[PDB]
Structure formats: structure tokens, C-alpha cells
Amino acid sequence: METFAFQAEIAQLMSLIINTFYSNKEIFLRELISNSSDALDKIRYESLTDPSKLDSGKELHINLIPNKQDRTLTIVDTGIGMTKADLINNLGTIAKSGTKAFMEALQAGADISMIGQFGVGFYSAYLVAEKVTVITKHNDDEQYAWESSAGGSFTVRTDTGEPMGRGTKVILHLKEDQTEYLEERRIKEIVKKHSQFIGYPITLFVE
Numbered sequence: 001m002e003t004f005a006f007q008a009e010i011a012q013l014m015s016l017i018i019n020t021f022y023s024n025k026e027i028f029l030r031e032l033i034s035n036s037s038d039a040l041d042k043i044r045y046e047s048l049t050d051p052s053k054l055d056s057g058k059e060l061h062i063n064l065i066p067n068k069q070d071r072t073l074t075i076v077d078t079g080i081g082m083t084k085a086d087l088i089n090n091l092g093t094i095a096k097s098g099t100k101a102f103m104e105a106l107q108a109g110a111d112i113s114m115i116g117q118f119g120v121g122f123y124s125a126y127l128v129a130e131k132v133t134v135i136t137k138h139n140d141d142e143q144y145a146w147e148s149s150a151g152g153s154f155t156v157r158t159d160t161g162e163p164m165g166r167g168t169k170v171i172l173h174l175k176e177d178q179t180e181y182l183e184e185r186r187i188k189e190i191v192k193k194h195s196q197f198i199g200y201p202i203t204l205f206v207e
């Protein structure tokens with residue numbers, strides 16, 4: 001397992017998300033589903049010129065998996081996935097400019113719900129999760145596990161868990177007071193409110 005320091009701007013973003021009083025936490029789900037949808041559009045687009053890009057799996061879908069025993073909510077997709085370079089460097093570079101723009105908009109009167117417009121909606125996971133684990137597999141790289149409980153650092157390791165074929169799993173280790181997001185009625189309500197027209201089948205798993 002390798003340990004990395006978040007860039008100052010992303011650490012500041014995560015602290016703002018964790019510390020700011022903001023009751024409309026439910027928007028985290030649409031942000032993660034939007035990232036999944038963008039990932040699925042990318043693999044679908046690439047497959048039109050190279051059909052062998054779907055040898056790692058033809059199905060293009062999103063699964064929402066609650067686990068009350070583990071207190072986790074997992075957002076699974078069969079999108080493009082992320083490489084080691086994406087996890088450590090590429091996406092952090094993109095997140096730096098988005099974070100600066102989001103911070104300025106917030107000072108000017110914007111709301112935390114607008115985070116996704118700045119391309120840093122992933123970090124809205126910290127509205128409800130004490131720890132986030134990202135398991136991912138891109139066609140050109142190995143399966144990786146990224147993880148962070150904030151506090152300025154994240155880890156990356158090659159993942160030895162169940163092989164995924166292709167895609168991303170975002171595992172939200174929910175805060176003790178955010179267990180409503182494990183309830184079927186609550187997830188169904190949020191999906192219908194904010195994610196009803198996503199162009200991929202969203203399956204809400206139950207227990």
C-alpha cells in the first residue's frame with residue numbers, strides 16, 4: 001500500500017465538505033451516479049471504433065448496493081474505469097482547477113449542491129462517508145484500490161479482492177448518523193428525485 005498527500009486545494013475542499021453545516025447531504029448520490037454515467041458514456045463511445053474494448057464486459061449499468069451489517073453504500077458501474085495514473089495524478093490535476101472555481105462560487109453565494117458543475121462532485125461522498133474506498137479496473141491497467149478517510153492523505157494499492165472485469169466501485173463507509181442512505185425507500189426517493197433520466201439501467205439492490 002502506497003500513501004500520498006492530497007494537494008492543498010483538494011485537502012481544503014474535503015475540509016470544507018466535512019466541516020460546513022449543510023443539511024442537503026442527499027445530493028452526494030446524484031454526483032456519484034453522474035461520475036458513473038460519464039464513465040459509461042466514455043467506454044460506450046470508445047467501443048464504437050474498437051469493439052474489443054467490451055471484451056472485459058458488454059453490460060453498461062449502475063448498481064446501488066446497501067449493506068447494513070458493514071454500514072456501506074456501494075455505487076458500482078461497468079464504465080471505463082481508472083488507471084493508476086488517474087488515481088494518483090491525472091484526476092487530482094483536473095480537481096485542482098475545479099476546486100478553485102467551486103471555492104470562488106461558494107464565496108459569491110453558490111451552494112454545496114452545485115459541486116458537480118465544477119467537476120469535483122466525487123468529494124461530495126464526504127458529506128455522508130467517514131471513509132471512501134474506490135475499487136477500479138481500466139482495460140489498460142490492473143485492478144486498484146484507492147482509499148481515504150481525509151485528514152490530508154489517500155492510499156493506492158493493487159487490489160486482491162473479487163476481480164471486476166472493468167469499471168469502478170465507490171464504497172461509502174457511512175458516518176454513524178447517515179444510515180438512512182442504507183434504507184430502500186430513501187435510496188429510491190433520491191434516485192427518482194435527482195437521477196431519473198440517467199441513460200443506463202440503475203438497479204437498487206435490497207437486503
Ligand SMILES: Cc1cn(-c2ccc(C(N)=O)c(NC3CCC(=O)CC3)c2)c2c1C(=O)CC(C)(C)C2
Pocket residue numbers: 035036038039042077079080081082086087091092094095119120122134146167168
Ligand atoms: C475528480 C475525481 C473524479 N473521480 C471519479 C470517480 C469515479 C469515476 C467513475 N465512476 O468512473 C470517475 N470516472 C472518470 C474517470 C476519468 C474520465 O475520463 C471520466 C470519468 C471519476 C475521482 C476524482 C478524484 O479526485 C479522486 C478519485 C480519483 C479517487 C475519484
